[PDB]
């Protein structure tokens, strides 16, 4: 009985108060920590760098003047969402930029971290490797192995609707003609 | 991965939504993915990261959803936010009377609920009034009862479990009461005899066995249910009894992880759990399924208590979805077709106040629209009853608007001179006490065949669910005569609410002053 | 981090101030920050770093504030400095009498408190004196009582829990007493029968069930409550009975961390804890809410004992704030509108002396000002009663100043020749025994309709809380006649303290020597 008290007691008793705004900085830094550093070095090497804003992502100097049309975004689960409500947007151009809205709940919950990591993966596939065309036959080979496999819901997990309708096996030409879908997967 | 409540599921999963899903032969717990779990018909669970059992009943959040649990807990209570507990009431099927020449009548019982309504089960029997014997007018004389005599009471009862979890050892004590406070008898708590199980929606003893005889037939009391004359008089005037039962159930059956054995632990006892459930959940009463009062409890948040604010917010619509079976074929709430709009919402005064507030900060007047935006707090009591029927003081279905009654009869499968064989929706035939048959002369006369208040029970039910009305039953065992192939044959139905149960002031037995609704009127040639 | 009391919360936090606050779905404990916590409406807790339970009752400092606790403990007792314990007293609803023609009267009971007042619960019943039957003048004759006869007593009672914690197994033994020391009977402690729960502010058995019959109705004693003639005489002159009850409650319900189960531990019993609470807390009695004596205990320091000096200093103002609900809309202590100045402060002789000292080192004379500077020590007894009402020896509300009584009636919702339908503040109609109605001739005559001492109960209450005075009740079932549309109709009210309970010396039944307050006077045409 005395044993159990210790774990619950520790989880509940915050000895000292970090502060009102420190928590935000510590949360974001911990989040970016989990991604392999080498990705960050590749990102810096190709130019623009991630900056964490605090307010409504819809209104920031870097993004207000560019890409006004793309107000419609789709989260990782495929559901639509408007940019103002969304808590993270990224943009591909001469200045690759990634903007993240500060919040205190990235360590505690997980659904928000998934969207952030999804955007880092999108920057990695579309902006870094694309300069070297790194996704290629090995990736195509695994990809192709997923479509044709015993009742593997894996497709449902990684393929969009457009892919579930290519009747035959994947071809090296298709990636060339269509390169947004594969980069998404 | 942290897990403070120590219930198997990690924190983030419990707070955000999770689901268990069997991957070929092994079951593992996974975070809810919107697209891959939804097409598979899996339910999105939520729970409290700081409660070993969010509902507060004796089964852990993990056990409920994984199935490691007493296989008797009803399916709908497998969901972590629906409290699983027993609800036992007593149903008396028929009685018999004599003097310390035996009046043996069949009774019908219904679980009741009346009005500031509180958490204690009671039922209510109604004794059949129709005259099984022709010559048995006035009970006071059919039994040679004198001013200084005493009658003997001998009834048959069974226990019904309409809750969601099984009871094991004990069986509840329950006291019969006539009138307001005249306690005729308290049914003993038989000892070491309920070694069987009462699973939800079951009877004890089962439908296959003789029902438990109330009088012992031994020497415990010569006539335990004695009853002076005056009681018998009140009973004759009212024809109804009450059965109040308390909540002293047995112990609890728990699941053992070491070997998967389900053993009844003698330490845990339902009389310690029920108060918790009763003080931290919202209560919903529904009479939709078969016109019986089904009570469910859903775990709702209580602002005043830290530990209690942890439970996931419950919107009324979601409560109905997971507790009873309402669904959305086209996004419109309905229970096997009947849209949510055919039901009334009644609330206790506290809850009423709270909901008026909720309707004010949303600027809405029709609850049926903003339904998915109403927050449930702890301790609300909500009563959802079908809007189409009239109801009495004890919230039992008792009558209805005439128009519904007529449409329910417009399908004449067959008609002859011996009676009708209809096919009516099983729910309506629970508010019709009987039928008045009459014949109409081509010039407006009126001849009522069964022209006695206690001669209405002429409608039986065939083994294929077709109702058949027999004229020869309370006739002279003779077929139906018609004085003119142009004479109309009229049939009236009498709903329960509008019935008479005793002879009038001057002992009138004719069906004159009874409000009768027309159900049939065909030509003599047509019959 | 050190933590000697071994109660989860660290030392510094307990001494300086902390608070529990739910962060979206996870609850955590934090040191009080003045600026960021105050806007959120969170309470600043304090406690003793060397006491596993500052109040000394069986729930840890941590359990109370975190909510991990028997969900039945009343809200006001969740705060670490307010002792949670039961207070059970017996309420008798009505009695009946006969001889071994049965006088069956309804009774009203009030939990009492008298003066050097001690820690033991007792109540006091008052039998209705009004004549339900016209012809039943003089009880001595309505029951054929002879010098050598004996009457039998058969009452109905319910147990009331007005404390702050639940009792579980036992129900207290309690002895009825007439006069100063004549014990008529001791109500047995039924065995293994109170398997239900008495949560605070509840009745056993609930208001929806028959009350527990006092007489067994079995063979234990033919008439357990025998009572010689002389006894019956004292009762006829006084109509008062006392119900003394002891403190033998059951076991205690404890919280299990492993699974969150609340189990009744058979080792811990309230009869071992109450003494601790009673010797280390200050006791405050308040009759503010509904004119009933509500007792609360707050943990205060006791200078003589080292371990006890550890408890946070308690100022009177905060005690009232956290124990009963007083607040500061504009910095003025008030309970739902009524300013703190409308209440009396009475103190036992010890406490009186101590507070006189406290008023001396501060050089103040009116305590209502320096309220936030009065330290509470252990063992003080304070009685706060409404200043507006007159009180009897047992601190029950018994009367009032005439001006208040008149002001309470200045709202005539309707007036006719059949009675008044008023809407009066629910509290006043508990100090008015009845009304004398009279009609006044244009020249000063006086005709009193109900001109008998035992004919005052003419005021009923409608289901919407509107008081209705019926003239035809104790009239001749006839409307009210007026000999002149200019004749004034006067109505007087008689408060309890000024009422008569028995016929006078020469058996006068007239309302002559009764102090009557004029309450109404409208001419014949103003009706």
From Swiss-Prot, chain A:
Keyword Repeat attached: yes
Highest taxon, organism lineage: Bacteria
Start and end residues of each ATLF-like domain: 6-185
GO cellular component, as recorded: extracellular region; host cell cytosol
Up-regulation conditions: Positively transcriptionally regulated by AtxA, which, in turn, is induced by bicarbonate and high temperatures (37 degrees Celsius).
Parts forming coiled coils: none
Record note on what altering residue 8 to A does: Does not affect translocation into host cytoplasm
Phenotype when changing residue 157 to A: No effect on PA-binding ability and fully toxic
Reported function: Lethal factor (LF), which constitutes one of the three proteins composing the anthrax toxin, is able to trigger rapid cell death in macrophages. Acts as a protease that cleaves the N-terminal of most dual specificity mitogen-activated protein kinase kinases (MAPKKs or MAP2Ks) (except for MAP2K5): cleavage invariably occurs within the N-terminal proline-rich region preceding the kinase domain, thus disrupting a sequence involved in directing specific protein-protein interactions necessary for the assembly of signaling complexes.
Protein name: Lethal factor
Species, as recorded: Bacillus anthracis
């Amino acid at each position: 009985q005395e044993e159990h008290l210790k774990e619950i007691m520790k989880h509940i008793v915050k000895i000292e108060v970090k502060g009102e705004e420190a928590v935000k900085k510590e949360a974001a830094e911990k989040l970016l920590e989990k991604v392999p550093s080498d990705v960050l070095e590749m990102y810096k090497a190709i130019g623009g760098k991630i900056y964490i804003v605090d307010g409504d992502i819809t209104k920031h100097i870097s993004l207000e003047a560019l890409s006004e049309d793309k107000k419609k975004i789709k989260d990782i689960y495929g559901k639509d969402a408007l940019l103002h409500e969304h808590y993270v947007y990224a943009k591909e151009g001469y200045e690759p930029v990634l903007v993240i809205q500060s919040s205190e709940d990235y360590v505690e919950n997980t659904e928000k971290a998934l969207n952030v990591y999804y955007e880092i993966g999108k920057i990695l596939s579309r902006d870094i490797l694309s300069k070297i065309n790194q996704p290629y036959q090995k990736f195509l080979d695994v990809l192709n192995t997923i479509k044709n496999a015993s009742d593997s819901d894996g497709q449902d997990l990684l393929f969009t609707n457009q892919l579930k309708e290519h009747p035959t096996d994947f071809s090296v030409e298709f990636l060339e003609q269509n390169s947004n879908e594969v980069q998404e997967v | 991965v942290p897990d403070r409540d120590n219930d198997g599921i990690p924190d983030s999963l419990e707070v955000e939504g999770y689901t268990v899903d069997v991957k070929n032969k092994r079951t593992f717990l996974s975070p809810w993915i919107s697209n891959i779990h939804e097409k598979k018909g899996l339910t999105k669970y939520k729970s409290s990261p700081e409660k070993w059992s969010t509902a507060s009943d004796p089964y852990s959040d993990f056990e409920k959803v994984t199935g490691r649990i007493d296989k008797n807990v009803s399916p709908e209570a497998r969901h972590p936010l629906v409290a699983a507990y027993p609800i036992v009431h007593v149903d008396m099927e028929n009685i018999i009377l004599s003097k310390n020449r035996t009046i043996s009548k069949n009774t019908s019982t219904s679980r009741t609920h009346t009005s500031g309504f509180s958490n204690s089960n009671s039922s209510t029997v109604a004794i059949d009034h129709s005259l099984s014997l022709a010559g048995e007018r006035t009970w006071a004389e059919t039994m040679g009862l004198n001013t200084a005599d005493t009658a003997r009471l001998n009834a048959n009862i069974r226990y019904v479990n309409t809750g969601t979890a099984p009871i094991y050892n004990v069986l509840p004590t329950t006291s019969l009461v006539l009138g307001k406070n005249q306690t005729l008898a308290t049914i003993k708590a038989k000892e070491n005899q309920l070694s069987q199980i009462l699973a939800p929606n079951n009877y004890y003893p089962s439908k296959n066995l003789a029902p438990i005889a109330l009088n012992a037939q031994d020497d415990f009391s010569s006539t335990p249910i004695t009853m002076n004359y005056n009681q018998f008089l009140e009973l004759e005037k009212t024809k109804q009894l009450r059965l109040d039962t308390d909540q002293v159930y047995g112990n609890i059956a728990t699941y053992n992880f070491e070997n998967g054995r389900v053993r009844v632990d003698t330490g845990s006892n339902w009389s310690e759990v029920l108060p918790q459930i009763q003080e931290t959940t919202a209560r919903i009463i529904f009479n939709g399924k078969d016109l019986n009062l089904v009570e469910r409890r859903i775990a709702a948040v209580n602002p005043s208590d830290p530990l209690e604010t942890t439970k996931p917010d419950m919107t009324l619509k979601e409560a109905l979805k997971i507790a009873f079976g309402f669904n959305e074929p086209n996004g419109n709430l309905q229970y096997q077709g009947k849209d949510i709009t055919e039901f009334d919402f009644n609330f206790d005064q506290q809850t009423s106040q709270n909901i008026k507030n909720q309707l004010a900060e949303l600027n809405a007047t029709n609850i049926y629209t903003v339904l998915d935006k109403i927050k449930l707090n702890a301790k609300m009591n909500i009563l959802i009853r079908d809007k189409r029927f009239h109801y009495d003081r004890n919230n039992i279905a008792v009558g209805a608007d005439e128009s519904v009654v007529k449409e329910a009869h417009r399908e004449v499968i067959n008609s002859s001179t011996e009676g009708l064989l209809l096919n009516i929706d099983k729910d309506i035939r629970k508010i019709l006490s009987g039928y008045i048959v009459e014949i109409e002369d081509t010039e407006g006369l009126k001849e009522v065949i069964n022209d006695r208040y206690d001669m209405l029970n002429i409608s039986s039910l065939r083994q294929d669910g077709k109702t058949f009305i027999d004229f020869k039953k309370y006739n002279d065992k003779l077929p139906l005569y018609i004085s003119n192939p142009n004479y109309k044959v009229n049939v009236y139905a009498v709903t329960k609410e509008n019935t008479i149960i005793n002879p009038s002031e001057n002992g009138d037995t004719s069906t004159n002053g009874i409000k009768k609704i027309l159900i049939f009127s065909k030509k003599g040639y047509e019959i």
